[PDB]
Amino acid sequence: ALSLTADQMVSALLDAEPPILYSESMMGLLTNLADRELVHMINWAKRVPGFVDLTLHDQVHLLESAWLEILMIGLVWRSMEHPGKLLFAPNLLLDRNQGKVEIFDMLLATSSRFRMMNLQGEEFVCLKSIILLNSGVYTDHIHRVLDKITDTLIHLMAKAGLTLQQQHQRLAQLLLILSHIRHMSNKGMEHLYVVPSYDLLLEMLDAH
Amino acid sequence: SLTADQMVSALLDAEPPILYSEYFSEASMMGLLTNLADRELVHMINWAKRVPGFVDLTLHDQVHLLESAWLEILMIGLVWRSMEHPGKLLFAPNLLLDRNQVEGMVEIFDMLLATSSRFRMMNLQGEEFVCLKSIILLNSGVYTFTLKSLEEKDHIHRVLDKITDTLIHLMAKAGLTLQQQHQRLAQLLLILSHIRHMSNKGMEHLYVPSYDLLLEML
Numbered sequence: 351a352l353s354l355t356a357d358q359m360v361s362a363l364l365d366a367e368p369p370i371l372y373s374e375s376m377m378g379l380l381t382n383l384a385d386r387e388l389v390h391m392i393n394w395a396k397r398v399p400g401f402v403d404l405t406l407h408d409q410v411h412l413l414e415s416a417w418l419e420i421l422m423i424g425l426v427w428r429s430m431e432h433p434g435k436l437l438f439a440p441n442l443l444l445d446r447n448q449g450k451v452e453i454f455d456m457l458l459a460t461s462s463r464f465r466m467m468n469l470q471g472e473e474f475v476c477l478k479s480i481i482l483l484n485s486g487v488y489t490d491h492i493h494r495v496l497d498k499i500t501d502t503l504i505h506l507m508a509k510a511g512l513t514l515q516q517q518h519q520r521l522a523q524l525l526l527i528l529s530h531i532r533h534m535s536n537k538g539m540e541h542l543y544v545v546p547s548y549d550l551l552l553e554m555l556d557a558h
Numbered sequence: 559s560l561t562a563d564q565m566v567s568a569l570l571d572a573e574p575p576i577l578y579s580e581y582f583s584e585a586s587m588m589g590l591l592t593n594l595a596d597r598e599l600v601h602m603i604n605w606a607k608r609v610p611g612f613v614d615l616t617l618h619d620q621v622h623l624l625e626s627a628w629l630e631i632l633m634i635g636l637v638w639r640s641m642e643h644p645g646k647l648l649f650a651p652n653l654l655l656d657r658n659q660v661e662g663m664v665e666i667f668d669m670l671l672a673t674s675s676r677f678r679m680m681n682l683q684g685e686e687f688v689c690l691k692s693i694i695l696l697n698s699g700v701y702t703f704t705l706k707s708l709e710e711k712d713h714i715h716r717v718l719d720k721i722t723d724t725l726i727h728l729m730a731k732a733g734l735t736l737q738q739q740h741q742r743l744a745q746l747l748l749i750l751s752h753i754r755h756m757s758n759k760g761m762e763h764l765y766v767p768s769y770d771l772l773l774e775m776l
């Protein structure tokens with residue numbers, strides 16, 4: 351799994367992207383959307399190179415720690431080309447006045463930062479994979495997979511013609527946004543208080 | 559226009575002192591810890607004013623950054639002081655606690671010990687530590703802030719890019735390959751995500767310096 355080249359890493363992550371779901375009272379709608387997204391997030395996670403080499407127990411615990419950050423970065427990515435709004439679904443585009451908002455504004459600020467940086471889709475899927483592997487790690491294989499996502503990000507920035515200086519500056523800019531995504535997830539849990547159970551996540555993993 | 563070497567030296571020179579507790583009971587512990595944190599906050603203000611680029615910001619923005627970052631900064635300082643003492647948190651040289659020494663305190667205690675362990679595994683260097691602490695100051699509040707606010711953010715990101723350049727410089731100096739430099743840069747910056755996590759958890763557990771207090775010292 352660690353033998354993939356950088357381009358093969360990118361290709362695998364792009365191929366594993368989950369579909370964009372539609373909405374089926376605001377907060378029942380958004381909860382139900384999140385619930386349906388979580389199954390597709392599990393299928394995605396199983397395709398992040400290195401993830402399924404962990405025990406099922408450690409897979410579940412990484413998902414327990416990461417699932418809200420992953421929903422949020424996906425939302426921010428979708429909303430990136432809709433200034434001042436959040437595209438929860440293609441049939442569910444909300445502005446902040448429908449938000450009444452503190453967390454809404456943080457998400458909008460993240461999407462605008464992504465817009466400023468002209469975040470690329472190949473960079474997005476790497477960041478999402480880092481969240482998966484990193485959010486639960488504090489609580490050797492995981493670190494080896496994280497290092498090769500770093501190698502892959504740097505490879506993408508070199509391919510785009512950035513200087514070596516610009517590469518490390520951009521790498522750092524992107525990883526600092528992950529601190530803000532963590533902050534939003536923490537404030538989001540406080541607001542939503544919700545957590546998918548160990549057994550629910552385990553069932554969606556569909557063990558052999 | 560500071561070089562990386564000048565950035566490192568300025569940050570090392572700005573380091574606050576390690577403070578002591580007064581010269582044990584569980585019942586007085588939180589009072590001692592709060593008194594220590596209060597005294598450290600005064601020195602943290604002086605340190606912040608010496609982080610290159612910080613005092614170029616408006617007073618209002620300086621307060622907002624410190625408002626967002628002060629707990630993360632106390633926490634990373636504690637983890638650094640604790641790094642050579644496995645299983646312990648060295649709040650002060652005369653206040654060294656283990657995890658057996660309040661509801662929800664041990665959960666945060668454990669996250670801090672895990673950060674200390676991570677520092678040891680990576681053999682974190684003092685020059686890297688001071689860079690990380692300056693990044694926290696400039697970054698933690700930069701997504702929760704007019705033409706003046708756009709100029710401020712620009713400056714903050716230019717200072718952050720300089721610190722990235724400085725970290726890479728330090729790592730290259732230590733003989734790391736270029737792959738190893740990027741890998742370690744990422745490893746260090748991902749630690750900042752965990753420090754943010756502990757700050758949010760800590761705020762929940764502690765429930766704070768006022769703007770006027772921060773403005774008065776600033």
Ligand SMILES: CCCN1CC[C@H](CSc2ccc([C@@H]3c4ccc(O)cc4CC4(CC4)N3C(=O)c3ccccc3)cc2)C1
Nearest residue numbers: 380381383384385387421422425453454538542544545546
């Ligand atoms: C078994 C039941 C457990 N399920 C139920 C709990 C657990 C799910 S709870 C839950 C999770 C997510 C949301 C949505 C939602 C939905 C889809 C998506 O892609 C993103 C978001 C973003 C956001 C999380 C911040 N959100 C809000 O509503 C929000 C947005 C901006 C400001 C404030 C609140 C809503 C509810 C799993």
Ligand SMILES: CCCN1CC[C@H](CSc2ccc([C@@H]3c4ccc(O)cc4CC4(CC4)N3C(=O)c3ccccc3)cc2)C1
Nearest residue numbers: 591592594595596598599632633636663666667760766767
């Ligand atoms: C008038 C403004 C009020 N002042 C404004 C600053 C003051 C704010 S409150 C406050 C801040 C800090 C702590 C200490 C403390 C002290 C010094 C230090 O270097 C680090 C720490 C770490 C830690 C914060 C997590 N802590 C705990 O006790 C703790 C530790 C592990 C698990 C759980 C709790 C304690 C209280 C109050």
